[PDB]
A paper describes a structure:
Each monomer is entirely helical and consists of a DNA-binding domain (DBD; composed of α helices 1–4), and a ligand-binding domain (LBD; consisting of α helices 5–13). The dimer interface is formed via interactions between the two LBDs and is formed mainly through hydrophobic packing interactions.
Co-crystallization efforts for [name] bound to avenolide yielded crystals that diffracted to 2.0 Å resolution, and crystallographic phases were determined using molecular replacement (Thorn and Sheldrick, 2013). Other interactions include hydrogen bonds between Thr131 and the C10 hydroxy, and an interaction between Thr162 and the lactone ring of avenolide.
Author numbering:
A (entry chain E): 0 to 217
B (entry chain A): 7 to 217
Write the structure that this text describes.
Amino acid sequence: AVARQERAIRTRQTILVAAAEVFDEVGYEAATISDVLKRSGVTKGALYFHFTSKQELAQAVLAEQVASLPRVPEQELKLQQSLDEALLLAHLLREGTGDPIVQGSVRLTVDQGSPRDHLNRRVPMQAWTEHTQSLFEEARAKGEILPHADVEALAKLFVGAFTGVQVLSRIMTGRADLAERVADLYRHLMPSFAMPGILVRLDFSPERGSRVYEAAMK
Amino acid sequence: AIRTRQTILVAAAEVFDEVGYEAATISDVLKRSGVTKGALYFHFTSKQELAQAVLAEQVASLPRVPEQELKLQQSLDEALLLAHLLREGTGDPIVQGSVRLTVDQGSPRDHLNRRVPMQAWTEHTQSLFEEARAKGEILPHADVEALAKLFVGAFTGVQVLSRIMTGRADLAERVADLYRHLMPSFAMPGILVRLDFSPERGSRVYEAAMK
Ligand SMILES: CC[C@@](C)(O)C(=O)CCCC[C@H]1C=CC(=O)O1
Ligand SMILES: CC[C@@](C)(O)C(=O)CCCC[C@H]1C=CC(=O)O1
């Protein structure tokens, strides 16, 4: 029983990682259960214990998007935390290795599909919006945000802007410039709402990005 | 014949919007455009060539906003116009489908070059920011290329989020938020206050652009 549940945990992750990969490579519609079976090396029995259909598997990779980012060390500035997360996500989307679910999950999110596929792409977008607003809320309690800033509007701006920065970067450089583009984004958004005292202390450097990455990989 | 090429282009874009590139067919396009097989094949050899042309026509499809002395306003006018056109469709029936073709990842096997509209938007936005900079609307040494990339990128994402969350119902608000929040990082003194974000202005811009 104890061993059965440990196997169940590991098997689900194995499926999710393999499924995200095939969804990344070929998209939702062209992907098959067979592709995922070939990639994971799990049995057909194992896959159906965890997921009911391709659709429900796709939904799960969508739903695990936010939970996929390694949690950054809890720190002094909440807006530095947001920057650290965004730059880590930029690294994870270019490299893939540190989190093999995100690339595929983002592709499923951003591909339009149709109402016919019954995928709920709002799921990860809502979760990122909540994630981001929550961090702004904590930043505001810690005196990091200007008075009368709309933290919901701001959260929606950050999620949307990040998404499109990602898209443009994917198209133009295959995400090679993504960390630089994300840094640029944060440098031009933060001045509208971050307390000036916080703004001078924020660290946008690839060296800090590198250290956060090295830390998150344990 | 040029108008027949456009009728086909509009129909192809709408078909690409509805069902995507892979699922779409010449037969869908012919049904939608109501042109003969001969008319289509004179202008395009394949679905692939059709897709490349609606991708290519993206920037040019955007109706020209009236020239403005405040160049930042001109950009805002364009941004809010494009928001409006992406939400409704009727004033630029090409753009919805062209955007889906740009944003959908597809595969390197499809021979579609998504770089073409993105490069064109970047050069367009860069030119405006050069004019803005020279007229003293933005910081004299602002990296106008990086800003263009930032604006094209951020707009695309705001668009994508709005489509997913509201079907683009909130797009104009979200684009306004984008411009309002990016501007203080690089605008010259007294410029941000001069900008007009109102939907009444947006409406006047829309009308003039169609005329
Ligand atoms: C702004 C930075 C951060 C960490 O707080 C996010 O909310 C990340 C948003 C990621 C959204 C994801 C969905 C589509 C896409 O391209 O990326
Ligand atoms: C920033 C405002 C503007 C007018 O100057 C643009 O460049 C618009 C960029 C349009 C990009 C297009 C591709 C995907 C998408 O969602 O929209």
